[PDB]
């Protein structure tokens, strides 16, 4: 119990952070990766001055400090703006003393060898953390649906990725990272809803359009005859009722968001999309163990959640695949905390408490133990 | 096989847009229903407000 | 093809009762949106009825 | 002044300054807003016992029917008076499409009326009925009028310089002779 | 000759029409994009009941009219009065019958297709004219400068907007808009001199509070030792003389009018202003494409003429550049009517011919086929 309740599991994303206990099913506490900075000097009535704020304070306070995002990308950009985000987490969030917590954290598919080292520099050295151990995202995830082999499309706020695992090791040249997600996804369906003739103008319109795009956004199979579909006029259209009675009507553009992940054409980009990029990993693999991960697609990650991703999918590889070859591909329903879940498992796991990086490895060997 | 298949990816496409349907709308319903012990509750303390006031 | 086949009676099966649990949610919300202009419409009248005593 | 015109106008003369004076006296008193002020001059026509008239410093018994609310629509209708400007409602609500998106649904519940001349009786049902149909339906609205309004201002300034946590803020001498004029300036 | 003398070039706008015929230096016709509706019954001496006005004798007449503005932020947003101002364009400005003359007409930045097509329906078959095209505004003002590839900053009466254009291809997902233009600043300048301890109270006063901004507004570079400069006070001020005697005296607010163009916080509004704009639609094109668009930035637009924007905009940006590029800012005299000259050479060019859309390909192929 000393650790089996007190393992704790931080998945750090560039859009949120998922939090909570090994053990749990699901994440304690999940809130965005901001830092919000006052602009000017003031109070709220009863509270004092306060240097900074972060995740959602940030966000509903955001009309008077300078928010900032500590993970571009996948990796921490500024380290004093992520102790600040780690510090809410433990503190405030889990409401934990992180002094007698064992911490798993999760880093990104290429994370740099000298950023490994440097938050277990913060984990030890700044919150004494009795021990702690860093698994790759696209690891987590492929785990948490009980495999070992895999490739994993992992898709959340800043970054895309394809990370090919074979019998647990993430296989670093055939990883592929695409910089488009959820957030990009969100600003275009934006940009095709103002064209539809709207004005998301207040804060209190911007901020909707991004739970238009949750909950009534799809990826539709065969993209080709679905805008053919939205000409006749079915009824394919979609009314959502905004803050007020404002009821704005999203037919069509409720699918054009989602075909951006399959043509990057769509928003200025000519890199390669979604599937093209699941296949191009696997044609950088070896050659015996691509009829695996062409059963083991596994999808993790916000943005890969639209209904009909995994069917569209299917078919964008089946139609690139030889056809002597088995296609499958896996979307669970948890997927948008699929790596999180992952670490739940793992840490709480039986067999992990000699991977753990203890303060005895440490102030005997170095930030280089854990790195591997 | 390709027709049990096909069959099925339009069985279980439709059983997901049903299930995300009834999600919005017990939604919507647990929302009104809840603006409603509200609307009715200051009710029946603006009736009495005014009883007392017409007294 | 049994595995099609058997996920299949079973996607259908949940498909049918997640359809009939909606159309009872959505008669149950329909009714509580109803009795509800009903609640607030006779309160706009009850509360300027006590603004117009009150004056 | 302009009752006084449409008070002239329905034949009468406030000729001495005691005559002047007690129009605006008449103005406070008997002076309505009319909810539906369309149909209301409409009432005034079929001469209902809504008439009023007020004994003036003498017994010269001064009758105010219909006048008695064409006085606060020129708050609503500043066209009532030569004034090209929008009015109270409108002006209410513009204010509101000024301010970010995300607080216009707080400035909607809490429209809080002060000043004396807000104290017209059914200025807040009028001001009510203006703006829910001139905001989003999805929207609450909530005009707020407080009976001791003419003094609100004074009341929070009372409220706040009485309490506990003001202390802190006031500023002294010893800030001014060593800060300037600047100090308070804020 | 045909057509050579006859090709007409109207620009469109939020606040000014300017038009006349291509082949000339200028706009023939320049005034108000107004359509004024009487609010009440009754006459002008010996003339009849006008239905409606349009242009100057709408703003001269507009206590008792309803004035409206067809054109919201650079797009046709009524279509009734916009025929409306092209009919008092043909008709009565420049006094041509159109159905013998060649149109080259402009839209905005990122115009909606349909808009282009409804334009087009209105040109054709409520004009009749022989043939027409629709230029976009950043392109003819590039191309006016001589240029093929460059970036527009244009700004006018109600938007901006940075158009990155290569080769003659305006780049659609580089384009910014920024919804502050001259309107807004003869607005705020108002304000600051109202604010001076000042009255603009009859429409007399209202009317030249915009001409005070065109004649004695600067742009200042090095706009904080400019207020410090105001305080030594300087024969910086500078006093104007109203309809009447009542000398009105302005030393400073002169370029606090300006200095709002970049910082939009000194109107409320939370956008990035004008140079870091330039910039992030210049960080959002291709990498190969970059030192061109820097070294061609072409100014146009009413709002741009203020004197030292130039400079101002020429340190603004290569402060933000990297120091190994060239940064060049070309502003024209003629620059409120670039784009309407660049059209003028356009349709005069003897290339052009054969890009007129001509009555047979429409009621052959429907408005589609301006479209492109």
């Known amino acids: ?372 | 096989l390709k027709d049990a298949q096909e069959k099925l990816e339009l069985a279980e496409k439709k059983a997901t847009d049903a299930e995300a349907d009834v999600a919005s709308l017990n939604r919507r319903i647990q929302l009104v229903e809840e603006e409603l012990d509200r609307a009715q509750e200051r009710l029946a303390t603006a009736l009495q407000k005014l009883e007392e006031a017409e007294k």
Request: proline residues 5%; charged residues 25%; hydrophobic residues 35%.
């Open chain 1, 1 to 372: 119990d000393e650790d089996e309740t007190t393992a704790l599991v931080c998945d750090n994303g560039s859009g949120l952070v998922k939090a909570g206990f090994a053990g749990d099913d699901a994440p304690r506490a999940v809130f965005p990766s901001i830092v919000g900075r006052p602009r000017h000097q003031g109070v709220m009535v009863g509270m004092g001055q306060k240097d900074s704020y972060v995740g959602d304070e940030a966000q509903s306070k955001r009309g008077i400090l300078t928010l900032k995002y500590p993970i571009e990308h996948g990796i921490i950009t500024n380290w004093d703006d992520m102790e600040k985000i780690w510090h809410h987490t433990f503190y405030n969030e889990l409401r934990v003393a992180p002094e007698e917590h064992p911490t798993l954290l999760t880093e990104a598919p290429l994370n740099p060898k000298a950023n490994r080292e440097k938050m277990t520099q913060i984990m030890f050295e700044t919150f004494n953390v009795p021990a702690m151990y860093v698994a790759i995202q696209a690891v987590l995830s492929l785990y948490a649906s009980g495999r070992t082999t895999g490739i994993v499309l992992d898709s959340g706020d800043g970054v895309t990725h394809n990370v090919p695992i074979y019998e647990g090791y993430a296989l670093p040249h055939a990883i592929m990272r695409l910089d488009l997600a959820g957030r990009d996804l969100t600003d275009y369906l934006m940009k095709i809803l103002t064209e539809r003739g709207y004005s998301f103008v207040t804060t209190a319109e911007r901020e909707i359009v991004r739970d238009i795009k949750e909950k009534l956004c799809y990826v539709a199979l065969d993209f080709e005859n679905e805008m053919a579909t939205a000409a006749s006029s079915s009824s394919l259209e979609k009314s959502y009722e905004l803050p007020d009675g404002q009821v704005i009507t999203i037919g069509n553009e409720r699918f054009r968001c989602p075909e951006t992940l399959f043509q990057p054409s769509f928003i200025g980009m000519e890199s390669a999309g979604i599937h093209e990029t699941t296949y191009n990993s696997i044609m950088k693999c070896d050659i015996d163990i691509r009829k695996d991960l062409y059963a083991n697609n596994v999808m993790s990650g916000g943005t890969t959640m639209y209904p009909g991703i995994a069917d569209r999918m299917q078919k964008e590889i089946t139609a690139l695949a030889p056809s002597t070859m088995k296609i499958k591909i896996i979307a669970p329903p948890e997927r948008k905390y699929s790596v999180w879940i992952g670490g739940s498992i793992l840490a709480s796991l039986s067999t992990f408490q000699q991977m753990w990086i203890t303060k005895q490895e440490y102030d005997e060997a170095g930030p280089s133990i854990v790195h591997r």
